[PDB]
Every structure is written in C-alpha cells, then in structure tokens.
C-alpha cells in the first residue's frame, strides 16, 4: 500500500500535500531505495522529485520540500537529493537551488542551502549557454540571483553560514557574475539602472568579502575583463557605467 513508483512520488510533491508522501520513508527503508535512484528520476533529464517540488511552489511554498529533504537525509543517501543535477545535454547541471532562485523564493533558497545545496553548481547545458536563444545568467546560483535582480537572494548566498557563494566564482567559460551582468545588460534607459545597481552592490560586496581581489580585473577564458567584454558585445550603457563608476 506504501509502494511508491515515480508517478506517485512526483504527483505527491506536485500538489504540495505532504500527507500524500505517507508511507514513503517506510517503503524506501524496506527496499533500500533512494530518491535519487534512476527509477525515481526522469529518464531524459535526471529531474528529481525535489526539483518537481521546487518547480511547484505556490506563493513561495511547497510543504513537500522539507519532508523530501528529511526523508533523503534519514535514508543516509551517499548522493544527496539536494545536489542532484540534470544530466541531459540541454539542461545539464540544473539543480533545485537554481529553480528556487528562478522562482524568487528566498525561503526555498534558504531551505535548500541549509540542507547542503551546492551554491557553486553550474547550470551549463545548452539551454543555459550562449551562443541561438538561451536562458543565460552565467550558470551559477549567485549569478542567477544577480541577473534576476534579487538582492535579498544575492545577500543570502554571499553571507550564509552553510556555504557562502564566492564573488570570484566563474561559469564554464570563466565568466564571473560581473561578466554575466554585462551579458544580460542592454542599452535601454528603462533597464540599465537595475543592472548597474546589482553591479555596484557586488563591487561593494567585494570590498567587504574579498578586499584584496580586484573583481573587475578577472578575465574570462576569452581573456576579457567585464569592461572589455562590454565593449566587445556592444553593451555601451554598462561599459559607460563601469568606466565612470568611481565618479
């Protein structure tokens, strides 16, 4: 009666009703199964029940998330559910933490990070890379938080007691959050203020958190600093920022 196949599991986290998970711990214990087992993940992408739960936040909330994390912890999973990543070429590296940030749920971000979610995991699949259409934010959780203009989430990622995210982290192409901000910037008057606001906030954070490191001098794998990247990519407004910032 307590048997959970993937359908039951996924359906039982999609509606956000934790009582629908009744019997799951006992079943996993009996069968020596884990929530990260191939039978419990989407075959095409490696999508897990935790990712499903986070994708199904309503009003920032899915009451199934913590129970899943607790079940996984209690099971003693050697490969924690929290850090599972997509395995397909398109969504490669996508994690529950990335989803939580995209959903703009600081509460979910905190829950995941508290439970060990890897703040330097890279969403590096084709969907997440330049260069037709893509959903680019420089692959990293911090960079996603910055590119989506979430200072509260950026702040938490940088300062939390579990795994602080590094301002110096780079994506698969050596792009830091500053490079990512250059990339997502445009030359529109209506959009630049928000971008330059996080940019400046991050530089200020750098002065606090890595004072000896000149973040603007970090070069990506194409040997470009954020300023030189801006110039290359025709990001005139941020290029002008970045130059005139200290005035």
From Swiss-Prot:
Q: List the disulfide bonds.
A: none
> What is known about its processing and modification?
N-glycosylated.
Source domain of life is: Eukaryota
Q: Where are the ANK repeats?
A: 2-44, 45-91, 92-136, 137-172, 173-221, 222-247
- The UniProt annotation puts the region (Required for interaction with SLC50A1) at 1-247
* Ranges facing Cytoplasmic side: 1-247
Q: Provide the protein's localization.
A: Cell membrane; Cytoplasm; Melanosome
Q: How does it assemble?
A: Homotetramer. Interacts with a cAMP-dependent protein kinase type II regulatory subunit (PRKAR2A or PRKAR2B) and ACBD3. Interacts with SLC50A1; the interaction probably occurs intracellularly and depends on TRPV2 N-glycosylation.
Instruction: State the similarity comment.
Output: Belongs to the transient receptor (TC 1.A.4) family. TrpV subfamily. TRPV2 sub-subfamily.
Q: What does this protein do?
A: Calcium-permeable, non-selective cation channel with an outward rectification. Seems to be regulated, at least in part, by IGF1, PDGF and neuropeptide head activator. May transduce physical stimuli in mast cells. Activated by temperatures higher than 52 degrees Celsius; is not activated by vanilloids and acidic pH.
Name by which UniProt lists this protein? Transient receptor potential cation channel subfamily V member 2
The shown range, given as first to last of full length, is 71 to 318 of 764
């Amino acid at each position: 009666p307590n048997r959970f196949d993937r359908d039951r599991l996924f359906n039982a986290v999609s509606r956000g009703v934790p009582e629908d998970l009744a019997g799951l711990p006992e079943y996993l214990s009996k069968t020596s199964k884990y929530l990260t087992d191939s039978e419990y993940t989407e075959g095409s992408t490696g999508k897990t029940c935790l990712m499903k739960a986070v994708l199904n936040l309503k009003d920032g909330v899915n009451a199934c998330i913590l129970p899943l994390l607790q079940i996984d912890r209690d099971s003693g999973n050697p490969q924690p559910l929290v850090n599972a990543q997509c395995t397909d070429d398109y969504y490669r590296g996508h994690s529950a933490l990335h989803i939580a940030i995209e959903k703009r749920s600081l509460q979910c971000v905190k829950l995941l990070v508290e439970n060990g979610a890897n703040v330097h995991a890279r969403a590096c699949g084709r969907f997440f890379q330049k260069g037709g259409t893509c959903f680019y934010f420089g692959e990293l959780p911090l960079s996603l938080a910055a590119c989506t203009k979430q200072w509260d989430v950026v702040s938490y990622l940088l300062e939390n007691p579990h795994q602080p995210a590094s301002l110096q982290a780079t994506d698969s192409q050596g792009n830091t959050v500053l490079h990512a901000l250059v990339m997502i910037s445009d030359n529109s008057a209506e959009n630049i203020a928000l971008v330059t606001s996080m940019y400046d906030g991050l530089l200020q954070a750098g002065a606090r958190l890595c004072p000896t490191v000149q973040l603007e001098d970090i070069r990506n794998l194409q040997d470009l600093t954020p300023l030189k990247l801006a110039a290359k990519e025709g990001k005139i407004e941020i290029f002008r920022h970045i130059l005139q910032r200290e005035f």
